[PDB]
Design a protein around this ligand. Sequence first.
Ligand SMILES: Nc1ncnc2c1ncn2[C@@H]1O[C@H](COP(=O)(O)OP(=O)(O)OP(O)(O)=S)[C@@H](O)[C@H]1O
Ligand SMILES: Nc1ncnc2c1ncn2[C@@H]1O[C@H](COP(=O)(O)OP(=O)(O)OP(O)(O)=S)[C@@H](O)[C@H]1O
Ligand SMILES: [Mg+2]
Lengths: 452, 452
Amino acid sequence: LSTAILKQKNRPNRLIVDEAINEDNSVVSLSQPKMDELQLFRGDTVLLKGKKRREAVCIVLSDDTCSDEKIRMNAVVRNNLRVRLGDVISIQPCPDVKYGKRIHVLPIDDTVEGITGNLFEVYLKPYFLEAYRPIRKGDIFLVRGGMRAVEFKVVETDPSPYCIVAPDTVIHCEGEPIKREDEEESLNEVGYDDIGGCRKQLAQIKEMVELPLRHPALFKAIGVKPPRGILLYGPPGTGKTLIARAVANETGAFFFLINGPEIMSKLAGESESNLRKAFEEAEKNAPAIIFIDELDAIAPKREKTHGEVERRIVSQLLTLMDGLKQRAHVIVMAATNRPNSIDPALRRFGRFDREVDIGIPDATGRLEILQIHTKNMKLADDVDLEQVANETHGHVGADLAALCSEAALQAIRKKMDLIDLEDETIDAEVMNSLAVTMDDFRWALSQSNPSA
Amino acid sequence: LSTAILKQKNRPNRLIVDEAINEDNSVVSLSQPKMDELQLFRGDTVLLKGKKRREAVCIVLSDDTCSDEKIRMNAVVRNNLRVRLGDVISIQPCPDVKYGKRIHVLPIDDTVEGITGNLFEVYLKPYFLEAYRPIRKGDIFLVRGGMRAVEFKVVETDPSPYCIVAPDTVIHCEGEPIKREDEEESLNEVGYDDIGGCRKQLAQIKEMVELPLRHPALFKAIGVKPPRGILLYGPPGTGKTLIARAVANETGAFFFLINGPEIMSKLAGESESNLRKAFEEAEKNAPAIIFIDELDAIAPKREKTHGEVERRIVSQLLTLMDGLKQRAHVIVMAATNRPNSIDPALRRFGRFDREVDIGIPDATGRLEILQIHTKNMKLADDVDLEQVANETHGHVGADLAALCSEAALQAIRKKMDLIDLEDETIDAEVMNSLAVTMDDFRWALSQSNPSA
Ligand SMILES: Nc1ncnc2c1ncn2[C@@H]1O[C@H](COP(=O)(O)OP(=O)(O)OP(O)(O)=S)[C@@H](O)[C@H]1O
Ligand SMILES: Nc1ncnc2c1ncn2[C@@H]1O[C@H](COP(=O)(O)OP(=O)(O)OP(O)(O)=S)[C@@H](O)[C@H]1O
Ligand SMILES: [Mg+2]
C-alpha cells in the first residue's frame, strides 16, 4: 500500500540468479526464449546490476538446462554483484565497450603466500589470451595455475569503469598485495538487506530521499516541492546509523556523512568550516545526501546550551538548510535518539520537516534482525531463531546483536577445555566444531537487558 | 563453568617449580622421562615463562632426584620468573639464540657499598668465563667474589631481549648503581595474584580483552565481532586501578594508560592531542589495550558540564571510539566509581558496550584481600585472618589495605619503648621481633571505617 515503492516489480530483464554450467568468470547464461525477448544475440557483452551499487560485465550465451526467468552465473560473478543464488538482478544490453589498453590488477595476500615466480605469466596471460574478456573496475576474479588458484582485484581500467581485454591490453600487476581484511570490509559493507524490522521506514526513506533525487521529474510534473530534511529518530540502538551506512552504500546519490561528535571534537570555527565544506561539497556533486549522524550533538536547543561556539553552530546549520535553493537537489538526512533535545527551529517547515520513526522492532523485526546477525555464524541444528525473537520483547537491533555476540562467547566458553589463552594459536579441529547451540542463546537470553 | 577461562590446563611443558640441586644461575633441571617427551636434549638453551610477563633463558640438564612433573631452579631464576616454589611455569624449546657482542650490566647499590676495586674483574669475568651463559634483559643475577656476593641487573643486550654470553661479548658495567628501591617497585609490580575477590570479574576481563586480542581467529571463525569498550565500575577502592595495573603487567597486548585527571590537567587542545596520541599509539602497536582510568573525569554528561573545552573532549573521545575500524585489534578499557555520571553516548553499542562490575567483596573476597595484603607482613602465630574477614562487612579492598596498615602501626606503637624518633637508625634486635599480633588487628578493627 505505502510499502509500494519497495515492491520487486516484474520485468523482462529482472532474472533469478541460478548456478552456472559454464564455469568461466566472463560468462552468464540465459534460456533461448529469454535472449530473443531482450534482443540479445550470442556473444554480446552485457551489463549486470547487482545489490549495493555493484555491477559486472559479461558475455551472454544460450542455455538449454537454464529456465526462462533465470540467469546462470558462477560464484565469482555472484560475488562481484554481491548476490546469493536466487536473488534478482537486472541484465542490460551493453554494446558500448571499448577495448582497454591499460589494466591494473592485484592479487589477494592470503591467496599468494610462497613463490611469486611471475604472476602475469603463470596466471594472467593464460586467463586473458585471445579471450576478449569483459571486466569492471572492482571485479574480484579467480585464476587457476598449476599448484593452486589466486584471487585478483581489478584496481584500474583504461576506459572509465569497464573495458574488453583485447590482446592490445597492457596488464599491469606490479604493486602491493591487496589485504584480505579490506575486501572482507568491502563484502560486509552494509546494505538494505543488513537492516531488519524497518520495512515501512525503509519505504519512507526511498520515498523521501531516493525518489526525489533520482526522479525529480515526478515532483516537478505533479507540481509539488520535494521535502529536503529527513530526521530519523528512535531509541538507542534501533538502526539509525546502520540505515545511514545502508543508504550510503545503496544510493545512486553522492553521500556525505557528518558525525555529530566528529564536528564538536574540532576547534572553534574549524567545525563551522567543516559544516560549510560538507554543504558546499554536496551542492557541487549534483544529486546528494547529507547525513548528519547524532544531530542532537550539533543542534541542541539554543536555550539549554552554554557555549557561544555551540550556539553559533546551530545558527551555522540553519543558515545552510535555508541556503540550499530548490534547484540544489540535496536532501539532508539526520539521526538522533533524543529528537526532543534538538532546537525546534531546525524541525520547522523546509528544514527537517519530515520524521522517520525507527522504533522498537516487533516480533517479526527481531526475527529479521537475528537472521541478519547470524548469517555468518555457525549455528547448530537445534537453534530456533523464531523462539529467540519471541523471548526478546524489549530488544532493539543493538541488543540482539549483543545477544548473538554473547551466545557466541558461551559456545567459546563450552570449548575452553581444548582452548588455552597461553597457546600461540587455537587447535584446528576445535575451530571447526564451533557451533552456537540454542542452549547458548538461552544463556545469552538469561543475561540479556533492554536499555529503554 | 564461566570461570573456565581461568583454569590451569595440564600440558607436557607446564611444570611445578622445585628447589635446584644444581645451584648455578643459568641452569634448570628436569627428569629424564620429561626431557624425552618435550624433545629437549642435554645442554639446550630453553625459554621459561613465569608470572606477570616475566621470562628467563636457561640451560636444561637431566636430574634423577627431580620428579617428572617438576622443574628444579635456584632462587635467582625463581626471582626472575617472579615465582615462589610450587608455581606453574612454561618450558619452551629455544634454539634461536645468537651470541651477544655487547651486554650492559649494573650492580645493585646496597650490595656494593665499600671497595669497588674492579667489578668486572672480581665478579663478572669469573661468572661468564667460557660459561656460554644465556641471559635475558631485566634478569637480576647474583655473583660471589671473595668477601661477599653482589647482585647485578641486565640493563641492555646485543640481540633484542636475550643472548648467549660467548667469550666474544663485551660486558659493559660502567654506570650508576641500580637503586634497590627501583627493583623492589619492579618485584612488587601488580599482577593477577595481587588482586583478590574478583575471580569472576577477572574471568570477564580475560574473555572480553585478552581472548579477542590474542586469539581473534575464534571470533572471526564463529562469525562474531569482538566487543571493543569495557567499562569497569564500582564503589571507591574496589580494585579498578589495581586491575588496570595487573592487566598492564600481565597482558601480551601493548598497553596504554590514560589517567582521567592527567588528561584534564593539561592545556586546552594539548589534552585533545594527548588523547589523539594515545589512540594512534595503540593503533600503531597492533594488538593493544587502552585503559582510561577515572573515565568520569574526561567524559561527564555533556549536559552537566559547563566548559567548552570539556564538552569538546567528550566529543573527541566518542570520535576516537568510533574511529577504530574492525581490523584495528584495539580494545578500550575504562574505570569509574560514578558510572552514571558518564555521558550515555559513550555507553552505547560499539563504544563502552560492556560493563564489568568490580563490586564490594564478600566474606571470601575479604579473606583473599587480607591474604594478599599480609604476604610481605610479619604476622604472629595467633593472627586469624578469617576472623578479620568476618568482622569487616562494609570493607572494600582499600579499607582492608588501610586496616592492615594500621594494625602494623599499632605493632610499631607497642615497640615504641625500644624505639626513638631522635635516633639515627633503629636497633637491630627490635626490627626482627616486629610481628603484627591479632590484638593489633582488633585495635585496627575498632578504629576502622567504611567510606560511609
Ligand atoms: N534494525 C536493525 N537491523 C539490523 N541490525 C541492527 C538494527 N538495529 C541495530 N542493529 C545492529 O546494532 C548495531 C547498532 O545499531 P546502530 O545503527 O549503531 O544504532 P543507532 O540506531 O545508530 O543508535 P544510536 O542512536 O546511535 S545510540 C548495528 O551495527 C547493527 O549491527
Ligand atoms: N579486590 C582487591 N584485591 C586486592 N587489593 C585491593 C582490592 N581492592 C583494593 N585493593 C587495595 O586497595 C588499593 C586501592 O584500590 P584501587 O584499585 O586504587 O581502587 P579503585 O577501585 O581504583 O577505586 P577508585 O574508584 O579509584 S576510588 C589497591 O592499591 C590495593 O592495595
Ligand atoms: Mg581507582
